[PDB]
Amino acid sequence: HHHHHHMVHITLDRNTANSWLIISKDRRQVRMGDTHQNVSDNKERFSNYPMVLGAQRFSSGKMYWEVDVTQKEAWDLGVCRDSVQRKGQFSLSPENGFWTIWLWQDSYEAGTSPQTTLHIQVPPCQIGIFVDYEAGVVSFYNITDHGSLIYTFSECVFAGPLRPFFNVGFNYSGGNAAPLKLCPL
């Protein structure tokens, strides 16, 4: 792909984070803590899952960023509406305001309803995410495999400002402690 020139500097919004997440001082890395991280509760925090939003809001244009997923067993990445539900249980789907892919139990899937099997021959260490607001497109690229396409959501009905979306996943296994990292331009 040739989307690299739409690169945007994404930073994480502490105030949206689940209370067990640890966000680095530069706001470019997030990982699961082994306990509550001693923050006050607020209506923005994702309560049920280890999720956090980027600070940036997009309502136009073309945007591209990259995320490092090295050695993780489970994660969700993509974009979501600024107004997605924060509390209680919910599915990641466009009907609920999410445009996401994930890794879970050694398989990759796109967050459609129902979910779609992805075909990845080279497990990615870094994922590229491309958003074209006007076109209604969210695309995912395998940086480890020369930028090969993973998945395109088209005909997207964003219906609001978009925010970068992250889930570090649970760490029940002891094999999923590694962080998500926003990679340099």
Ligand X SMILES: CCc1ncc(CNC)s1
Q: Which is nearer to ligand X, 59 or 71 (CB)?
A: 71
Strand pairing category for 29-32 and 21-23:
antiparallel
Residues lying near ligand X in the complex (CB under 6 A): 18, 20, 32, 48-50, 170-172
Cβ 119 to ligand X shortest distance, Å: 30
Cβ 136 to ligand X shortest distance, Å: 32
Strand pairing category for 12-13 and 62-68:
unpaired
Minimal CA–CA distance to 45: which of 76, 68, 66, 14?
Answer: 14
Question: Residue 160: how many CA atoms within 13 Å on its side-chain side?
Answer: 13
Q: Which is nearer to ligand X, 69 or 168 (CB)?
A: 168
Using CA atoms, how far apart are residues 38 and 36, in angstroms rounded to an integer? Answer: 6
Q: Which is nearer to ligand X, 102 or 141 (CB)?
A: 102
Cβ 81 to ligand X shortest distance, Å: 21
Cβ 63 to ligand X shortest distance, Å: 28
